[PDB]
Amino acid sequence: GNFDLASLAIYSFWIFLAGLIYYLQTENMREGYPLENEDGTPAANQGPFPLPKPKTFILPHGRGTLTVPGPESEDRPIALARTAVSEGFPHAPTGDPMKDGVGPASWVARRDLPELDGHGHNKIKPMKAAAGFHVSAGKNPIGLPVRGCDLEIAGKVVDIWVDIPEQMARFLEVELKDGSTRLLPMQMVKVQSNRVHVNALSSDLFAGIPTIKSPTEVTLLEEDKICGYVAGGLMYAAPKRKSV
Amino acid sequence: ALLSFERKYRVPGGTLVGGNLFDFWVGPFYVGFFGVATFFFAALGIILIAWSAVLQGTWNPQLISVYPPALEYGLGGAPLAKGGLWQIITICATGAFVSWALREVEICRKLGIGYHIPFAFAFAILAYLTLVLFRPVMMGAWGYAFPYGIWTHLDWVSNTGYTYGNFHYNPAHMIAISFFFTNALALALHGALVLSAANPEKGKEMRTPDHEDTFFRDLVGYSIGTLGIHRLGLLLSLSAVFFSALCMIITGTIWFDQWVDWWQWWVKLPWWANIPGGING
Amino acid sequence: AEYQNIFSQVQVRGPADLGMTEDVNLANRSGVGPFSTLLGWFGNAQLGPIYLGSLGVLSLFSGLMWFFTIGIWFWYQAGWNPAVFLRDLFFFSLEPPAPEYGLSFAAPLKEGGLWLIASFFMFVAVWSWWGRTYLRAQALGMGKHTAWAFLSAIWLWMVLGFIRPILMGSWSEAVPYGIFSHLDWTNNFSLVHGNLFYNPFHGLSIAFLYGSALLFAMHGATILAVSRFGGERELEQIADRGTAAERAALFWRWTMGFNATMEGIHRWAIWMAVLVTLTGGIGILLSGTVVDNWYVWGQNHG
Ligand code: BCL
Ligand code: BCL
Ligand code: BCL
Ligand SMILES: CC[C@H]1c2cc3[nH]c4c(c3C)C(=O)[C@H](C(=O)OC)c4c3nc(cc4[nH]c(cc(n2)[C@@H]1C)c(C(C)=O)c4C)[C@@H](C)[C@@H]3CCC(=O)OC/C=C(\C)CCC[C@H](C)CCC[C@H](C)CCCC(C)C
Numbered sequence: 001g002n003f004d005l006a007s008l009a010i011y012s013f014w015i016f017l018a019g020l021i022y023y024l025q026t027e028n029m030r031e032g033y034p035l036e037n038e039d040g041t042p043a044a045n046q047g048p049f050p051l052p053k054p055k056t057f058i059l060p061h062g063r064g065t066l067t068v069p070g071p072e073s074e075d076r077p078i079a080l081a082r083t084a085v086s087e088g089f090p091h092a093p094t095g096d097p098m099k100d101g102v103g104p105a106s107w108v109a110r111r112d113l114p115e116l117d118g119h120g121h122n123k124i125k126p127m128k129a130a131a132g133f134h135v136s137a138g139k140n141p142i143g144l145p146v147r148g149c150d151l152e153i154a155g156k157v158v159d160i161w162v163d164i165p166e167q168m169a170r171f172l173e174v175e176l177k178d179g180s181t182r183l184l185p186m187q188m189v190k191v192q193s194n195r196v197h198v199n200a201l202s203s204d205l206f207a208g209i210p211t212i213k214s215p216t217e218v219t220l221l222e223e224d225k226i227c228g229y230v231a232g233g234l235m236y237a238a239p240k241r242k243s244v
Numbered sequence: 245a246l247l248s249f250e251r252k253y254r255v256p257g258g259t260l261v262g263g264n265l266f267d268f269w270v271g272p273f274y275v276g277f278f279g280v281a282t283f284f285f286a287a288l289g290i291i292l293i294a295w296s297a298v299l300q301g302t303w304n305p306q307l308i309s310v311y312p313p314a315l316e317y318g319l320g321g322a323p324l325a326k327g328g329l330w331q332i333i334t335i336c337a338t339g340a341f342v343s344w345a346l347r348e349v350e351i352c353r354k355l356g357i358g359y360h361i362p363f364a365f366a367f368a369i370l371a372y373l374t375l376v377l378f379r380p381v382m383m384g385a386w387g388y389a390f391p392y393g394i395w396t397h398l399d400w401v402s403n404t405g406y407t408y409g410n411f412h413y414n415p416a417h418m419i420a421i422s423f424f425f426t427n428a429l430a431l432a433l434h435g436a437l438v439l440s441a442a443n444p445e446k447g448k449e450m451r452t453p454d455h456e457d458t459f460f461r462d463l464v465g466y467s468i469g470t471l472g473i474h475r476l477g478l479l480l481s482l483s484a485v486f487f488s489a490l491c492m493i494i495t496g497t498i499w500f501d502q503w504v505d506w507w508q509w510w511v512k513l514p515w516w517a518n519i520p521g522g523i524n525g
Numbered sequence: 526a527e528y529q530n531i532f533s534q535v536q537v538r539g540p541a542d543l544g545m546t547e548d549v550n551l552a553n554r555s556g557v558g559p560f561s562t563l564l565g566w567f568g569n570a571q572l573g574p575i576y577l578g579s580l581g582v583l584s585l586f587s588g589l590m591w592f593f594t595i596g597i598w599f600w601y602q603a604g605w606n607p608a609v610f611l612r613d614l615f616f617f618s619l620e621p622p623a624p625e626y627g628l629s630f631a632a633p634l635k636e637g638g639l640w641l642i643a644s645f646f647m648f649v650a651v652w653s654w655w656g657r658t659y660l661r662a663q664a665l666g667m668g669k670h671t672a673w674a675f676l677s678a679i680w681l682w683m684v685l686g687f688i689r690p691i692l693m694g695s696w697s698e699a700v701p702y703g704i705f706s707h708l709d710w711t712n713n714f715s716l717v718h719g720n721l722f723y724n725p726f727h728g729l730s731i732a733f734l735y736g737s738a739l740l741f742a743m744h745g746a747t748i749l750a751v752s753r754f755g756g757e758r759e760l761e762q763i764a765d766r767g768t769a770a771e772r773a774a775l776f777w778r779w780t781m782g783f784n785a786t787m788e789g790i791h792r793w794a795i796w797m798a799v800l801v802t803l804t805g806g807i808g809i810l811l812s813g814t815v816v817d818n819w820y821v822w823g824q825n826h827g
């Protein structure tokens with residue numbers, strides 16, 4: 001230092017970068033904190049960063065607001081139990097982890113409404129109800145039989161559910177043997193020339209994919225259950241996954 | 245302690261080695277077999293560095309430096325005091341980084357996510373390995389790798405560059421620079437865009453990704469979209485490192501003269517080589 | 526092989542999206558351009574529409590004149606011969622006035638005047654484009670983060686081309702318009718200032734430039750890794766956290782012991798990037814105005 005301008009500037013920069021990191025870390029604590037013990041009570045050691053002052057997001061289309069930080073709560077039962085007498089070990093599913101939605105089958109209790117676009121219309125629609133939408137490039141999946149990782153057919157593709165504002169494919173709607181349908185995340189299927197293959201699930205697990213309560217829209221809560229369930233099969237359908 | 249939403253995801257399984265033997269956390273950190281491997285390699289690494297400090301006669305971290313074996317050693321081993329420590333520390337480094345990548349894979353499996361992170365990370369490891377392993381192997385000596393020291397490695401960068409004139413003239417290096425600057429451009433833009441939608445003018449409602457496409461279309465006539473932009477950032481930054489690896493793997497090996505002179509191939513193409521005027525005639 | 530979601534498998538198309546209106550003057554938007562199935566494998570297929578008010582027309586025009594002015598000089602350097610123009614393209618240079626002319630505008634066209642003209646046009650192109658980034662945000666009710674972020678890049682450029690030359694007392698300190706010639710300028714700048722590696726601001730700039738690649742690799746990889754739960758729909762994940770946002774936090778928490786939020790990762794992002802050119806521009810500004818030699822300075826200040 002310090003009767004030199006470059007020295008004053010670099011010293012000042014470090015002070016600023018320390019404040020910036022502090023600010024950035026506290027901004028990143030608007031969700032998930034305070035830290036909890038494994039029983040859900042507040043942990044003793046919160047760290048040296050305090051919770052920031054809340055901010056409020058005004059949500060569009062009369063959906064209200066979100067104020068964070070606020071009271072954290074799962075708003076759903078978690079079918080898991082301890083496997084050790086001390087902290088830091090896994091928690092074993094107490095039933096079927098795919099049905100109970102724990103582990104990599106986990107879902108969050110998002111709003112039970114669909115995501116809306118800029119004009120207040122449902123963001124995701126079956127292509128059949130999406131005026132003017134059509135497949136523009138690539139193999140069209142509609143009509144292909146759907147194969148699970150047990151190398152067995154679980155059903156047939158009956159539509160693509162599309163993101164209207166982003167003009168992209170988000171799910172395949174798949175008809176099962178009983179005539180009902182399910183949604184499969186597009187990120188979890190492989191469209192092949194003569195089939196759609198689903199590595200994550202064996203055929204017998206398709207029935208258990210969480211259903212949507214109205215056939216022409218999907219809610220944020222429903223997306224989370226479907227995507228959770230399908231992801232969970234990488235781990236939990238592993239015994240039925242023939243080598244490939 | 246756990247995040248408010250964490251418990252449901254801390255289930256058994258996903259490990260690559262050891263079954264349940266290491267399927268546990270220490271505070272926030274997942275361990276696993278590769279957690280134990282990472283600790284072992286890092287720890288042995290840091291202790292060897294600390295010991296190299298002793299042999300150097302300093303404990304200052306702006307001064308501590310571990311140099312590789314001198315070029316006379318070729319690709320054999322060197323005494324600990326004189327390059328040996330560097331060689332074992334490089335093995336520990338490699339073991340730590342790869343162990344860290346594989347631990348990341350175990351974490352992905354437990355969480356049911358894609359493997360894109362450890363895959364991205366593997367480009368950094370490869371860049372490191374180019375400089376300390378592939379390039380030295382291909383040039384015939386460990387002496388060509390960089391020393392491990394905060395400033396001494398910067399000297400290596402400068403001395404290595406000026407060995408080939410102004411290193412700017414490395415064409416793979418120009419591409420790499422371009423991806424780095426473009427990646428930083430995409431990062432500013434992406435952060436600013438999402439925050440501008442999440443944080444609108446005072447009193448107004450959060451904007452929508454439709455607002456994010458509109459902003460960019462109004463502005464430059466194109467929007468890559470929200471899946472697009474994350475694909476882009478991943479491509480830009482991985483491409484930056486790939487070309488970095490490339491620009492060095494070729495320097496000292498296929499090209500070793502002054503980089504400016506490489507551009508003569510274009511200038512001397514026969515259809516214009518002899519046409520007078522210009523800078524080169 | 527698991528689908529990795531780097532390229533799309535099926536593209537869908539619908540009616541051209543003409544975008545949100547909010548307060549935007551619609552008279553100034555074009556119609557949509559063509560759709561590119563090629564782009565569509567990676568991002569959106571739709572090209573256009575673009576907004577072109579008077580500030581846009583000014584900025585493009587000015588930007589084109591800047592490109593006209595350098596181009597005319599190049600063609601002249603090439604003796605008007607397209608063979609030579611292509612041959613020597615990277616060697617041509619539009620160079621600023623000599624030291625003798627200081628900060629005056631009195632230099633001949635072939636020897637400074639054209640460089641000033643070009644720099645004039647560029648200055649108008651950039652600043653009005655800056656204003657455009659603010660004004661387009663405003664019309665859609667959005668925050669001004671983009672214009673603030675763009676301002677950090679403008680900073681480094683302003684320092685290199687305008688502020689530092691002015692403080693040094695001559696235009697000859699500014700950067701020439703040329704591919705090779707500007708690389709040479711950069712090298713020479715470091716040599717003559719005692720090696721920029723000893724400039725702490727230059728080091729910081731590198732930390733942020735590398736860190737930007739680190740960060741966007743982390744982030745883009747993370748979002749793609751959780752795209753099977755709708756991860757890229759970040760605004761709604763901000764408004765209503767989903768299992769995408771929770772798995773992404775927890776990947777990082779379990780790996781390195783701390784994590785971000787869906788909004789907050791964008792604050793780390795905007796800052797990591799912007800600090801590239803903030804610190805970078807400080808480093809350059811101080812060079813030759815206050816520190817002639819960074820090695821020397823380094824020996825007396827740490
Ligand atoms: C006088 C010097 C020469 C020159 C000589 C060289 C030389 C020599 C090299 C470069 C390299 C590069 N140069 Mg050059 N270069 C010059 C001018 C420039 C300019 C400029 C504006 O002028 C720029 C922007 C660049 C840009 C670059 C990049 C393209 C590339 C560096 C990134 C990289 O390799 O990442 C790759 C990333 C890594 C290697 C990081 C690896 C990280 C590992 C895996 C993780 C470590 C974990 C750590 C130990 C953990 C710590 C503990 C925790 C933090 C708790 N050069 C001048 C002309 N340049 C380098 C390159 O391409 O290398 C391959 C290189 O070797
Ligand atoms: C990539 C091309 C060249 C090179 C060229 C340059 C140039 C040029 C510069 C640096 C700079 C840095 N480099 Mg180097 N560097 C190289 C390879 C490496 C490797 C490696 C294991 O391969 C490491 C760990 C580093 C580490 C570093 C940091 C000391 C410093 C800031 C970087 C940064 O923020 O990056 C981005 C990463 C982050 C923001 C994440 C945090 C990373 C932290 C800071 C790493 C701490 C490293 C620690 C001190 C090393 C010891 C590990 C311990 C024993 C556990 N470099 C290769 C040889 N590097 C700058 C500097 O200021 O040097 C003095 C600088 O100007
Ligand atoms: C031999 C060369 C010297 C050296 C000399 C210099 C000089 C001189 C400078 C740098 C600077 C930088 N160097 Mg160095 N550098 C060296 C060695 C290195 C090494 C290395 C591995 O060895 C690395 C990684 C770097 C890296 C860096 C960067 C961190 C930094 C530039 C950031 C940036 O985004 O700029 C790019 C961003 C811009 C230039 C902003 C531009 C914004 C404007 C508004 C865009 C206008 C566009 C116009 C309209 C045309 C667009 C047309 C479109 C198609 C529409 N240097 C050696 C020591 N370096 C810069 C800096 O900040 O230093 C402190 C700088 O000035
Ligand atoms: C490929 C694109 C870019 C990228 C991506 C990237 N890096 C990553 C990842 C990804 C995707 C991770 O997932 C991983 C991570 O956890 O990040 C938080 C990581 C990572 N990138 C890191 C650093 C880093 N990345 C860099 C670069 C890049 N990373 C690219 C630009 C750089 C530089 C210099 O540019 C650095 C310094 C770490 C924060 C983290 C990896 C952490 C890790 O491997 O931990 C295990 C090892 C240890 C805890 C210590 C090892 C100790 C050694 C045995 C001794 C030290 C030897 C070393 C060679 C000495 C170096 C001295 C220096 C002065 C030269």
Ligand SMILES: CC[C@H]1c2cc3[nH]c4c(c3C)C(=O)[C@H](C(=O)OC)c4c3nc(cc4[nH]c(cc(n2)[C@@H]1C)c(C(C)=O)c4C)[C@@H](C)[C@@H]3CCC(=O)OC/C=C(\C)CCC[C@H](C)CCC[C@H](C)CCCC(C)C
Binds near residue numbers: 671672675799
């Ligand atoms: C913060 C650090 C980084 C950063 C950030 C950043 N840059 C930015 C921004 C931000 C936040 C913007 O908002 C702004 C932007 O618009 O991005 C899309 C910008 C920008 N960064 C740019 C470039 C850029 N940034 C760089 C660097 C960086 N930018 C840093 C790494 C670099 C380098 C050198 O690394 C470059 C080259 C521009 C793309 C854009 C600013 C545009 C601008 O100022 O334009 C003025 C010039 C013109 C308008 C000329 C237009 C010429 C066209 C090609 C003509 C097209 C018309 C057609 C050919 C003819 C039609 C008529 C016919 C009859 C002739």
Ligand SMILES: CCCCCCCCCCCCCCCC(=O)OC[C@H](COP(=O)(O)OCC[N+](C)(C)C)OC(=O)CCCC[C@H](Br)[C@@H](Br)CCCCCCCCCCC
Binds near residue numbers: 430464554556557
């Ligand atoms: C970031 C800026 C980069 C440099 C700045 C310039 C970038 C934009 C360049 C602008 C070029 C536009 C060309 C002229 C515009 C034009 O006339 O388009 C016409 C046509 C037809 O419509 P009309 O003429 O019929 O509309 C007339 C109005 N009405 C119908 C109301 C009467 O419309 C179009 O084709 C618009 C399509 C423009 C697409 C532009 Br060129 C996109 Br593809 C450029 C993409 C470049 C990406 C930007 C680089 C950004 C880099 C960092 C991250 C962004």
Ligand SMILES: CCCCCCCCCCCC[N+](C)(C)[O-]
Binds near residue numbers: 021049782
């Ligand atoms: C580039 C440097 C980034 C390092 C940021 C350091 C943040 C450490 C955060 C630790 C806090 C974790 N905790 C206890 C709040 O959960």
Ligand SMILES: CCCCCCCCCCCC[N+](C)(C)[O-]
Binds near residue numbers: 320321323331
């Ligand atoms: C691949 C990177 C380093 C490989 C090093 C190969 C040689 C082993 C180092 C041991 C040197 C010490 N000693 C006494 C055994 O020679």
